[PDB]
């Protein structure tokens, strides 16, 4: 029960959820600290070589940045202590792990979760403070109320599971 059917997993965040009518139905407001803590490994492609290069040149401190690089050899270089080296140029076939920006679907859940509606994907909108902001048209399938209720947020780490998670 505690090691096969279920388990404690990484790439998740738990905090108090609150309402925000200015947001959309499917979105969710994620705090900046959670967006900088969690990450997502993206594959370097000629379509986003300049953008990922900018994320590398920004640093892990800034939100539009990265955290770790993975060369094609299967080796991870941390951006921290990498500025002491000087320059890091990306090539085709690498995997740079960026922070959670906008338009990133992540699974949203609230225990005990007895519905299949209690776990639903959402589009990340980066907002300050520390509470998960969401629209009030989604609190009825979650059976939640804005009185100290915490929720869980899981992040997919692959493009295949992200697309399959967005289409289902």
């Amino acid at each position: 029960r505690g090691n096969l059917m279920g388990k404690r997993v990484d790439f998740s965040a738990r905090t108090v959820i609150s309402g925000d009518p200015n947001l959309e139905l499917d979105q969710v407001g994620v705090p900046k600290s959670i967006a900088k803590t969690l990450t997502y490994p993206e594959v370097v492609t000629p379509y986003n070589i300049d953008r990922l290069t900018q994320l590398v040149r920004n640093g892990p401190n800034e939100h539009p940045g990265a955290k770790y690089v993975i060369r094609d050899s299967g080796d991870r270089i941390d951006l921290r202590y990498s500025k002491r080296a000087g320059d890091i140029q990306l090539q085709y076939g690498w995997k740079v792990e960026r922070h959670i920006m906008d338009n990133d679907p992540v699974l949203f859940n609230r225990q005990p979760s007895l519905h299949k509606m209690s776990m639903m994907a959402h589009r990340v909108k980066v907002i300050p403070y520390s509470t998960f902001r969401l629209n009030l048209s989604v609190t009825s399938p979650y059976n939640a109320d804005f009185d100290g209720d915490e929720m869980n947020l899981h992040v997919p780490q692959s493009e295949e599971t992200r697309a399959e998670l967005s289409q289902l």
Binding site: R1, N3, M5, G6, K7, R8, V9, D10, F11, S12, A13, R14, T15, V16, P31, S33, I34, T37, L38, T39, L107, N109, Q111, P112, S113, L114, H115, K116, S118, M119, S130, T131, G148, E150, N152, H154, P156, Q157, S158, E160, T161, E164, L165, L168
Partner: protein, 98 residues
């Protein structure tokens, strides 16, 4: 502009509880593992991850997403590589692959 409906307005005694957001918000992305099961630890002070229990897996089966379940139960948690033998399916295969 004046509001159309009058508002019930007056002082009221309130109290502040122990529950605060600064002692609740936490996120984990690749942290320390336990010594027994080599799984993410339990507790916010130990930099622990959230629990993907049985009901969550049952919901993932209800949605029909098997790739996200496999990734969540392998790469997102713990993934081990072992060698088994053809005649007997036990893990007695000594592997000296240097």
């Amino acid at each position: 502009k004046k509001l159309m409906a009058q508002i019930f307005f007056g002082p009221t005694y309130y109290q502040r509880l122990r529950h605060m957001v600064d002692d609740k918000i936490h996120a984990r992305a690749r942290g320390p593992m336990q010594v027994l099961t080599r799984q993410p630890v339990e507790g916010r002070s130990r930099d622990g991850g959230l629990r993907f229990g049985e009901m969550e897996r049952d919901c993932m089966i209800a949605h029909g997403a098997a790739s996200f379940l496999k990734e969540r139960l392998m790469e997102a948690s713990d993934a081990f590589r072992v060698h088994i033998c053809g005649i007997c399916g036990l893990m007695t295969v000594i592997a000296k692959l240097n």
